[PDB]
Design an enzyme around this catalytic site. Sequence first.
Site, PDB file in Angstrom:
ATOM      1  N   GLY A  20      -1.468   7.438  -9.252  1.00 29.94           N
ATOM      2  CA  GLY A  20      -0.154   7.590  -8.654  1.00 29.94           C
ATOM      3  C   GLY A  20       0.974   6.994  -9.464  1.00 29.94           C
ATOM      4  O   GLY A  20       0.801   6.620 -10.621  1.00 29.94           O
ATOM      5  N   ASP A 138       9.449  -5.373   4.188  1.00 27.22           N
ATOM      6  CA  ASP A 138       9.059  -3.984   3.925  1.00 27.22           C
ATOM      7  C   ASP A 138       7.689  -3.659   4.503  1.00 27.22           C
ATOM      8  O   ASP A 138       6.895  -2.965   3.890  1.00 27.22           O
ATOM      9  CB  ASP A 138       9.105  -3.682   2.418  1.00 27.22           C
ATOM     10  CG  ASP A 138       9.190  -2.186   2.119  1.00 27.22           C
ATOM     11  OD1 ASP A 138       9.657  -1.424   2.994  1.00 27.22           O
ATOM     12  OD2 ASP A 138       8.783  -1.769   1.007  1.00 27.22           O
ATOM     13  N   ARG A 142       2.689   2.579   4.687  1.00 28.73           N
ATOM     14  CA  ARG A 142       2.559   2.959   3.283  1.00 28.73           C
ATOM     15  C   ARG A 142       2.392   1.744   2.350  1.00 28.73           C
ATOM     16  O   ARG A 142       2.040   1.904   1.192  1.00 28.73           O
ATOM     17  CB  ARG A 142       3.748   3.806   2.830  1.00 28.73           C
ATOM     18  CG  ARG A 142       5.032   3.036   2.751  1.00 28.73           C
ATOM     19  CD  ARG A 142       6.249   3.913   2.492  1.00 28.73           C
ATOM     20  NE  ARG A 142       7.441   3.076   2.551  1.00 28.73           N
ATOM     21  CZ  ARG A 142       8.058   2.766   3.681  1.00 28.73           C
ATOM     22  NH1 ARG A 142       7.604   3.255   4.821  1.00 28.73           N
ATOM     23  NH2 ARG A 142       9.116   1.973   3.677  1.00 28.73           N
ATOM     24  N   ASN A 143       2.650   0.540   2.859  1.00 29.10           N
ATOM     25  CA  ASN A 143       2.520  -0.682   2.076  1.00 29.10           C
ATOM     26  C   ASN A 143       1.247  -1.441   2.432  1.00 29.10           C
ATOM     27  O   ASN A 143       0.999  -2.552   1.948  1.00 29.10           O
ATOM     28  CB  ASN A 143       3.792  -1.538   2.207  1.00 29.10           C
ATOM     29  CG  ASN A 143       4.938  -0.986   1.366  1.00 29.10           C
ATOM     30  OD1 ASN A 143       4.697  -0.397   0.311  1.00 29.10           O
ATOM     31  ND2 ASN A 143       6.180  -1.161   1.827  1.00 29.10           N
ATOM     32  N   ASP A 156       2.717  -4.879  -1.679  1.00 29.97           N
ATOM     33  CA  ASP A 156       4.107  -4.592  -2.011  1.00 29.97           C
ATOM     34  C   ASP A 156       5.040  -5.750  -1.682  1.00 29.97           C
ATOM     35  O   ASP A 156       5.735  -5.731  -0.669  1.00 29.97           O
ATOM     36  CB  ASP A 156       4.589  -3.327  -1.304  1.00 29.97           C
ATOM     37  CG  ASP A 156       5.991  -2.924  -1.728  1.00 29.97           C
ATOM     38  OD1 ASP A 156       6.114  -2.076  -2.642  1.00 29.97           O
ATOM     39  OD2 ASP A 156       6.968  -3.459  -1.153  1.00 29.97           O
TER      40      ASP A 156
HETATM   41  C1  LIG Z   1       0.886  -0.101  -1.634  1.00 31.64           C
HETATM   42  O1  LIG Z   1       0.337   0.467  -2.822  1.00 31.64           O
HETATM   43  C2  LIG Z   1       1.097   0.610  -3.959  1.00 31.64           C
HETATM   44  C3  LIG Z   1       2.426   0.999  -3.842  1.00 31.64           C
HETATM   45  C4  LIG Z   1       3.196   1.157  -4.980  1.00 31.64           C
HETATM   46  C5  LIG Z   1       2.628   0.935  -6.231  1.00 31.64           C
HETATM   47  C6  LIG Z   1       1.298   0.546  -6.377  1.00 31.64           C
HETATM   48  C7  LIG Z   1       0.457   0.367  -5.283  1.00 31.64           C
HETATM   49  N1  LIG Z   1      -0.825   0.009  -5.336  1.00 31.64           N
HETATM   50  C8  LIG Z   1      -1.354  -1.196  -5.529  1.00 31.64           C
HETATM   51  C9  LIG Z   1      -0.595  -2.431  -5.871  1.00 31.64           C
HETATM   52  C10 LIG Z   1       0.346  -2.887  -4.947  1.00 31.64           C
HETATM   53  C11 LIG Z   1       1.104  -4.014  -5.236  1.00 31.64           C
HETATM   54  O2  LIG Z   1       2.012  -4.480  -4.336  1.00 31.64           O
HETATM   55  C12 LIG Z   1       0.919  -4.678  -6.439  1.00 31.64           C
HETATM   56  C13 LIG Z   1      -0.004  -4.220  -7.375  1.00 31.64           C
HETATM   57  C14 LIG Z   1      -0.770  -3.092  -7.097  1.00 31.64           C
HETATM   58  C15 LIG Z   1      -1.768  -2.623  -8.134  1.00 31.64           C
HETATM   59  C16 LIG Z   1      -2.885  -1.266  -5.446  1.00 31.64           C
HETATM   60  N2  LIG Z   1      -3.058   0.152  -5.140  1.00 31.64           N
HETATM   61  C17 LIG Z   1      -4.026   1.094  -4.860  1.00 31.64           C
HETATM   62  C18 LIG Z   1      -5.414   1.044  -4.772  1.00 31.64           C
HETATM   63  O3  LIG Z   1      -6.104  -0.110  -4.978  1.00 31.64           O
HETATM   64  N3  LIG Z   1      -6.056   2.201  -4.480  1.00 31.64           N
HETATM   65  C19 LIG Z   1      -5.379   3.361  -4.271  1.00 31.64           C
HETATM   66  O4  LIG Z   1      -6.042   4.513  -3.972  1.00 31.64           O
HETATM   67  N4  LIG Z   1      -4.042   3.421  -4.350  1.00 31.64           N
HETATM   68  C20 LIG Z   1      -3.311   4.674  -4.118  1.00 31.64           C
HETATM   69  C21 LIG Z   1      -3.375   2.309  -4.636  1.00 31.64           C
HETATM   70  N5  LIG Z   1      -2.016   2.181  -4.757  1.00 31.64           N
HETATM   71  C22 LIG Z   1      -1.889   0.827  -5.044  1.00 31.64           C
END
Ligand SMILES: COc1ccccc1-n1c(-c2cc(O)ccc2C)cn2c3c(=O)[nH]c(=O)n(C)c3nc12
Length: 265
Positions: A20, A138, A142-143, A156
Amino acid sequence: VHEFAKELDATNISIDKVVGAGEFGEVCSGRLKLPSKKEISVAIKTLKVGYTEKQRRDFLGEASIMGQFDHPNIIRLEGVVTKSKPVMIVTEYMENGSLDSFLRKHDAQFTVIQLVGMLRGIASGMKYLSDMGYVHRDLAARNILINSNLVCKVSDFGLPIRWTSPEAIAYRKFTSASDVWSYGIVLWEVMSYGERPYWEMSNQDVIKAVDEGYRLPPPMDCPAALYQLMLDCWQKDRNNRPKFEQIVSILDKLIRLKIITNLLL
Ligand SMILES: COc1ccccc1-n1c(-c2cc(O)ccc2C)cn2c3c(=O)[nH]c(=O)n(C)c3nc12
């Protein structure tokens, strides 16, 4: 940043896929080899090439916050990569992605107890968050990320009208009680299987309607207990909202419901 965030060696990290896109750059999945030699699945936020000093400081700012939290229902920070490029934030991997898109794929396919399990997890993570003096601002389905065992974890920490309490919208009064309001919306989102809060109502109408006392209706087949919990989280007087600890307590009792229940006034 390295106060709370471990620098990772990039040589210990494999990228396997692009899962993504984020505000600051692609999001990827891969694996991380730990100092003990164990290998784990990770998610990876990357900072777009050509970033500015301000983007970098804001990007990595999330890791400084995230690094202070160690809890089963808060996304776990594995570390960051800053000494090489691209710059990255690395966390545990969540198989089933965002809670809201996960639930939209499974409309009415889970039991009430399963949903409550998810909700309890979110509430517990938020209880720890507020215990640490942080206001999320937030909190939204979705978070929330959900893993292969359905365990939900808050994510997030970068900081959204539909999720914001009336007083926070009106004059930026953000407290743990406005987070509790947000939790109420998440609770609606979960019981609705990923429906958008207030659908596509214009923002001004969401603001005015909520201010007038109008609230999201009970989702289909919502147990009265969970609906009343939403209404409690959405008390106009923020001092009347339950604390996360009580929300956790409430959900632990429901987990141990037969009564089933345009905005309502
Ligand atoms: C809420 O998920 C996200 C939203 C925006 C961008 C990335 C992710 N985001 C994050 C993440 C979230 C954070 O706050 C900080 C660092 C990270 C790597 C982990 N993952 C995953 C994940 O572990 N597995 C997923 O399938 N997806 C779609 C994810 N999307 C995220």
